[PDB]
Structure 1
Amino acid sequence: MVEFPEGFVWGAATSGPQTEGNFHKQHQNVFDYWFATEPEQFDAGVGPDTASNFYNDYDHDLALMAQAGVQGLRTSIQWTRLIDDFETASLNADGVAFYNHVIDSMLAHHITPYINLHHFDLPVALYDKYHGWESKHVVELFVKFAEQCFKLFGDRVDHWYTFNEPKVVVDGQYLYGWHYPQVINGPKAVQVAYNMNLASAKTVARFHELSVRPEQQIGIILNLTPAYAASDDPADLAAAEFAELWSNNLFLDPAVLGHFPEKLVERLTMDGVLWDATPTELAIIAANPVDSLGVNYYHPFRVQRPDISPKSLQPWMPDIYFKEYDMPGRMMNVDRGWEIYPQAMTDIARNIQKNYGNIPWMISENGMGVAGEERFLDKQGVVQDDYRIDFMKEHLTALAKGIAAGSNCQGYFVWSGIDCWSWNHAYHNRYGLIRNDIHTQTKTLKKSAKWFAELGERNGF
């Protein structure tokens, strides 16, 4: 009844930091270092050191995911595992061998690889030495790392992504304390958002210098949730318009249209917090847009006016212009604190189709996190996650409406394949099609896995 285009990709999304574990990894990223020194900041004291044991059990993990109808797996290559010397991007041989093993195994199981280069995992040594993403030198080191990935694996990987949601890096490392180093500095955050936008452009440039097949393409993964104003009142609208420019246009516009949003640049210039740019850097951004777009969506985004005037003496933050708003009568994922609003996927699809040239895009992430899933085991040891199937049904329904209106969506990737380590939340919330009992790292298909495999076979539901 709900059907999908011929050739639609049914996939799963994870990342290296949340699956592999730190086995034999040469370098600490910022989350590795944070757990090593502040294990109390992580749920039940569970860090990334073992995660879901993908380093050791990748071949059987891929077999399980293949059973669950995963036609494409998007994951990430860790900068801190592939590279020995960050300055020259020399290679760690065992890191190279591991990713060769993973990729060949995907292929042996008929899973198309989607390879993203960075998922929140900056080497902590680059933060100590250069302050990380604030440094344009670090931006160059990143490009060197990307070059190695393309040279080593571009023979059998077609689909690439530069970053998974750079905004979460900006937000987490420099605004709200989610990511080590937990800097709280608005103006620095502005410069970091610029630098990652520039690092992405330079990575598309290097990618196409080395591309040999016409199938090879590289994208970026962004969150494009609309900023819904609380009311039609003018102050709520003004808060919405800025929240939109800041949370969406800051990255979508450079990546797809090749320039930063004029109104946002004007605003940050007025507040004296604009980034430092050179003409050459702006020319690189303008000359190397992405080939495709990955959209991550989980919950809506609503915004009302700020409590106090933005002109009050206070540290600059993007939040001086908008405040989060809770809508009465919202439909809630109560244990999780997330509103359920599948219509936003249709809003997203329409925007891409209308204002961004209907660039090729996919749902790179959509999923539901539930705690204590052992409450839903049946008498055969399988999690009856009907709530997860329902969640997928409602959101896929909204997505198909966007497609029927003509949006260029080409796939849907579940977060996630196998339950994986969710940063400070660790394993408190489960998202997978496949459960992981993490004391023994024993993995077992959930009920939704069989439904997902069957969805891919009928290409609908």
Structure 2
Amino acid sequence: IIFPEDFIWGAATSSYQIEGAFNEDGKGESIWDRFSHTPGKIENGDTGDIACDHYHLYREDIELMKEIGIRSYRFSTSWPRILPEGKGRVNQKGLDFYKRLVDNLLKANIRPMITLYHWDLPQALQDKGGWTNRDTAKYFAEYARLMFEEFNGLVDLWVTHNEPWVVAFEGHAFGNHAPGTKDFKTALQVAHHLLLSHGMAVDIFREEDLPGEIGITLNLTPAYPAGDSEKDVKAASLLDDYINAWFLSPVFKGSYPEELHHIYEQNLGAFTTQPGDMDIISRDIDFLGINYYSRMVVRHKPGDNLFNAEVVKMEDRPSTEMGWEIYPQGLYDILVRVNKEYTDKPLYITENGAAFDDKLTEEGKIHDEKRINYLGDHFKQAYKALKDGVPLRGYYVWSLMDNFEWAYGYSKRFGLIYVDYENGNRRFLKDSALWYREVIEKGQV
């Protein structure tokens, strides 16, 4: 098992999950500032106020990146740190932080990949309806243009959006994520505008003529029938469209999946679109980012919901601390399917990783063998996909460091690096980081 010597091994983070400095240097409020400061939304009342304090500690963090030897670092930029009101006047100190960060990465021979939207919408824009207001799509594109202009010739890997399914449905249907709305109709309208805003930024990227590549990042969860039933097969197919095709088809085919679109429209009524929207959404892009963690096993169940389907708990299979099934085969299956059905463009795994109950020992080590076994098994499936002709160019581990795991707060640790929050926010390389270091040196698992 040996990867190409130029294969792009990396690690990933996001702004709200690591930066801290939540109201420092003119930064505006985000929907995740607001949400986490709302009682009962986050486990243990955790907030991202300080988190890993990467905003002040980023130089030390880049030293640790160099120790592991990652070739690329995927991070997101905070829209409200740069444009506090979401539009209007740039906050120069906020922008200067990312200019310093990128200069330091380039000096370290670490190739940056910027995610423009990793969920921290300006609260100023949420007060005008957030993603149900089509203007939010326009202002996102304007923010994209600013960033393209400022990092022309410095950043050549760009992702518009991280996981629009999650933003739409966890954020607005089930209310587990900011802004915390619980209305499925709103979630559909949101999804459309996220997709729209993506295409709008792609158009601007081409016009600005920067050197480099632009794409989008989707969480993809492959679905499997619980049984041989032709009804279990249709059920899994529908849930596969719910999560995956709902965003894959618009981006690569210029249409929503037909049956599911019908089902939604019949029960909820139509969400608002303008003519030509599917043309914008489906602009040609340069790569697809895939975030993969697990699968879903699905059985038919007429009653409970709109898809007449429920997900089966695989209780006799190993799982992570999140309760997610460990299922490395799913990473191969989804890479192969995307390449077969949707696109021949380069693919990146922009996230894969796992939470386990990490214990810091009585001097500074973390023996997270479960994480080593998890990543190893998934690296092997990526290799198999490669060998079978999938144009996989890179693999980013989630995460470079322990961080704020959204509604779970700091209770869930995904890092290669342990963050000892209470003790000066000090960092410790886990065994999995030492392991990943060996993999990258050799290009061999």
Q: TM-score, normalised by structure 2?
A: 0.95
Q: What residue in structure 1 maps to residue 324 of structure 2?
A: 338
Deviation sequence 1:272-293 (CA, Å, 0-9, x none): 533221113223224x132111
Q: What residue in structure 2 maps to residue 188 of structure 1?
A: 186
Q: 2:224 aligns with which of 224, 228, 237?
A: 228
CA displacement at 1:307 relative to structure 2: 5.0
In 2 relative to 1, CA 367–235 (structure 1 residues): closer, same or farther, beyond 3 Å? Answer: same
Q: What residue in structure 1 maps to residue 17 of structure 2?
A: 18
Moved more, 141-150 or 18-27: 18-27
CA displacement at 1:356 relative to structure 2: 2.0
In 2 relative to 1, CA 336–189 (structure 1 residues): closer, same or farther, beyond 3 Å? Answer: closer
Q: What residue in structure 2 maps to residue 365 of structure 1?
A: 351
Q: What residue in structure 2 maps to residue 301 of structure 1?
A: 296
Residues 1:280 and 2:285 are matched in the alignment: no
Q: 1:402 aligns with which of 382, 385, 391?
A: 385
Residues 1:99 and 2:111 are matched in the alignment: no
Q: What residue in structure 1 maps to residue 174 of structure 2?
A: 176
Higher relative contact order (CA 8 A, sep 6+): 1
Residues 1:321 and 2:308 are matched in the alignment: yes
CA contact (8 A) 2:141 2:197 kept: yes
CA displacement at 1:60 relative to structure 2: 0.9
The code of the aligned residue for 2:323 comes to G
CA displacement at 1:57 relative to structure 2: 0.8
CA displacement at 1:327 relative to structure 2: 3.1
Percent identity, aligned pairs only? 34
Q: Secondary structure at the match of 1:157?
A: coil
In 2 relative to 1, CA 294–37 (structure 1 residues): closer, same or farther, beyond 3 Å? Answer: same
CA contact (8 A) 2:235 2:307 kept: no
Q: What residue in structure 1 maps to residue 47 of structure 2?
A: 47
Q: 2:340 aligns with which of 354, 372, 391?
A: 354
**Residues 234-313 of structure 1 aligned to structure 2 (within 5 Å):** 234-286=230-282, 288-308=283-303
Aligned residues: 442
Q: Secondary structure at the match of 1:41?
A: coil
- 5+ residue gaps, structure 2, are none
Structure 2 distance, partners of 1:342, 1:364, is 16
Q: What residue in structure 1 maps to residue 2 of structure 2?
A: 3
Structure 1 distance, partners of 2:337, 2:259, is 18
CA contact (8 A) 1:299 1:340 kept: yes
Moved more, 355-364 or 343-352: 355-364
Structure 2 distance, partners of 1:212, 1:120, is 25
CA contact (8 A) 2:9 2:440 kept: yes
CA contact (8 A) 2:85 2:122 kept: no
Q: What residue in structure 2 maps to residue 420 of structure 1?
A: 403
CA contact (8 A) 1:13 1:416 kept: yes
CA contact (8 A) 2:11 2:398 kept: yes
CA contact (8 A) 1:190 1:273 kept: no
Residues 1:30 and 2:4 are matched in the alignment: no
Q: What residue in structure 1 maps to residue 433 of structure 2?
A: 449
Q: What residue in structure 1 maps to residue 76 of structure 2?
A: 76
Deviation sequence 1:134-192 (CA, Å, 0-9, x none): 11011111111111111111220000000110111111122112113322212221111
Structure 1 distance, partners of 2:184, 2:159, is 27
CA displacement at 1:431 relative to structure 2: 1.2
Q: Secondary structure at the match of 1:452?
A: helix
Deviation sequence 1:96-121 (CA, Å, 0-9, x none): 11110111111111111000001111
CA displacement at 1:28 relative to structure 2: 1.3
Q: What residue in structure 1 maps to residue 156 of structure 2?
A: 158
CA contact (8 A) 1:120 1:169 kept: yes
Structure 1 distance, partners of 2:210, 2:148, is 11
Deviation sequence 1:413-461 (CA, Å, 0-9, x none): 0011111111121221211111110011111211211211111111112
Q: Secondary structure at the match of 1:339?
A: coil
The code of the aligned residue for 1:195 comes to H
CA contact (8 A) 2:418 2:427 kept: yes
Structure 2 distance, partners of 1:20, 1:180, is 18
CA contact (8 A) 1:373 1:430 kept: no
Q: Secondary structure at the match of 2:16?
A: coil
CA displacement at 1:347 relative to structure 2: 0.3
Q: Secondary structure at the match of 2:396?
A: strand
CA displacement at 1:328 relative to structure 2: 5.3
CA contact (8 A) 1:85 1:91 kept: no
Structure 2 distance, partners of 1:186, 1:403, is 38
CA displacement at 1:372 relative to structure 2: 4.4
Structure 2 distance, partners of 1:182, 1:36, is 12
CA contact (8 A) 2:74 2:113 kept: yes
CA contact (8 A) 1:342 1:394 kept: yes
Moved more, 163-172 or 349-358: 349-358
The code of the aligned residue for 2:30 comes to N
Q: What residue in structure 2 maps to residue 314 of structure 1?
A: none
Structure 1 distance, partners of 2:380, 2:358, is 28
Q: Deviating runs (4+, > 4 A) in structure 1?
A: none
CA displacement at 1:41 relative to structure 2: 3.1
- The alignment yields a C-alpha RMSD, in angstroms, of 1.7
CA contact (8 A) 2:35 2:180 kept: no
CA contact (8 A) 1:191 1:274 kept: no
The code of the aligned residue for 1:48 comes to G
Structure 2 distance, partners of 1:120, 1:212, is 25
Q: What residue in structure 1 maps to residue 215 of structure 2?
A: 219
The code of the aligned residue for 2:31 comes to V
Structure 2 distance, partners of 1:272, 1:41, is 27
Structure 2 distance, partners of 1:382, 1:321, is 47
In 2 relative to 1, CA 307–259 (structure 1 residues): closer, same or farther, beyond 3 Å? Answer: closer
Structure 2 distance, partners of 1:399, 1:33, is 38
Structure 1 distance, partners of 2:342, 2:308, is 26
Structure 2 distance, partners of 1:307, 1:266, is 17
Deviation sequence 1:280-320 (CA, Å, 0-9, x none): 3223224x13211111111211222235176xxxxxxxx54
